[PDB]
Design a protein around this ligand. Sequence first.
Ligand SMILES: [Cl-]
Ligand SMILES: [Cl-]
Lengths: 305, 303
Amino acid sequence: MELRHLRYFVAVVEEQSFTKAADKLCIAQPPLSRQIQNLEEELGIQLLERGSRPVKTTPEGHFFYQYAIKLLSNVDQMVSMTKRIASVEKTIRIGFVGSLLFGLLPRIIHLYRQAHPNLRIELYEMGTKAQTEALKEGRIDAGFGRLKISDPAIKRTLLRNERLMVAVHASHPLNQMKDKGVHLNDLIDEKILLYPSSPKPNFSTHVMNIFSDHGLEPTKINEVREVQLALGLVAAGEGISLVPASTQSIQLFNLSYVPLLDPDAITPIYIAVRNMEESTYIYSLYETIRQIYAYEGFTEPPNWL
Amino acid sequence: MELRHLRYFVAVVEEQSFTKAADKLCIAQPPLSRQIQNLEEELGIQLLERGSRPVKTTPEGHFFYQYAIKLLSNVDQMVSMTKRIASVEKTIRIGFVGSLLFGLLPRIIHLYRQAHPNLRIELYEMGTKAQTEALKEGRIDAGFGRLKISDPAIKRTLLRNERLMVAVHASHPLNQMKDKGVHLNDLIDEKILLYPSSPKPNFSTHVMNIFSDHGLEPTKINEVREVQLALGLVAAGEGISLVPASTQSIQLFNLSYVPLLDPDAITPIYIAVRNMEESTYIYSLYETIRQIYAYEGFTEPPN
Ligand SMILES: [Cl-]
Ligand SMILES: [Cl-]
């Protein structure tokens, strides 16, 4: 038998009518009656005095109603009880892009971590496209990326614009311009290393937008898998690359970082959250970004609160 | 006739009586009435209602008044302009891109002409790359553009960030969001008409960039010759199109413009001058823009 068999019987007994029971179940009278019939023909006992109005129970049905109500109610309790032991431990899932690993994100996470010793924190290297998908889908709670998001269900805050830099070998003509800087236009015809080869749109997309925003489109490009390969290939003299300033966490012999003069040769750092987000766990993260930044001397991101 | 007659005629219609107009000019009304009489016979047409004392003008008389306030207003401009001329004749050459003709540019230029009555201004339509190599060579002295410029021989300053908008046929579903606007995301699958088809970079580049900033690369795209075509075709039920806000200068039956909600769905406007530029004419140009920008409630920059 079914619980549906029971809920139907119970609705008929209480209402003492087949109509007030089918309407309160939002079903038709025929299927309702047929199911209780199927219940009776399965038990071998008649529960209802059918034909006598208002509908009432057989003595056997009168006992069955009492056990049925309890059993339905114990199903209700089971479900509830089962839901009480489940899902105690709070988890915050944070998505981020690999390039952000060389900046402040780690120390930010560590601090937030000290602030919440009872919180499970899961970290996932993901791109902005996946982050947006994972956010809307609940899979993550806060994303960090370099590429703006086109999606109304999501909200981006710009945390800080970060300066682009030209990684060059030490013998390169441009290295003579290390102190002062070069312009994007000075790079236009060099072999340029773009990275990562990871799913678009990634940092290579951004670099190209920067050149395109400045009327430029370099033909000598060569996409490479990762940032260390970029730098590594540069320090072997394959060519130049464009990297965030924070990437200067990586120093390789004869690898020389060189500023850009173009006021808009910048890569922004965003935090993305679901549009209607309000967890104190995210604001606490946000506050932690504000705390670290001031500590470091960057301008603070604006008020959540 | 003489200016006397027009001035004399102006006061009688401004101040509605013969004696009250005579008070304004501090002269006798016996000859004043003769002068206005002397005007109508020369024309061979009456200008005022014969005997009516409210007072009021005739069909042809009223038209003449407005013509007169315009002429008299220009004789003052003749007087005022002639005192502040310049030195026999300089030429300032200005480069701009076509899309700027729909915004505040021509009104800036028009008011600029007024500051320098004797100045020969020379307008040249050209894209950014061409404005660069033209400023470096002296062939222009300012360049109004929509593209960023890796300098360094060139100083550019951001004047304003014009909103982008989506041109759509009024039947299009997006047109529901006419007073609420949309996001680029909604355009991902749309038929998008990019303009123009000149040498790149140009506005199409920019739009392809704007989409790129946001992690979007549309596939259903056509590049068309220019803005009118793009709009024309949008009306012709051919697709959608991304325009600067000022394109709404062009209005077509069943065309409607949807605003974009994305914060960076924008088209910047830059003046570009030679790095070491301190000419008074250019400084003057800067201030006209600030003058105009102020008038329209927009932001002034430290130029
Ligand atoms: Cl960082
Ligand atoms: Cl404008």
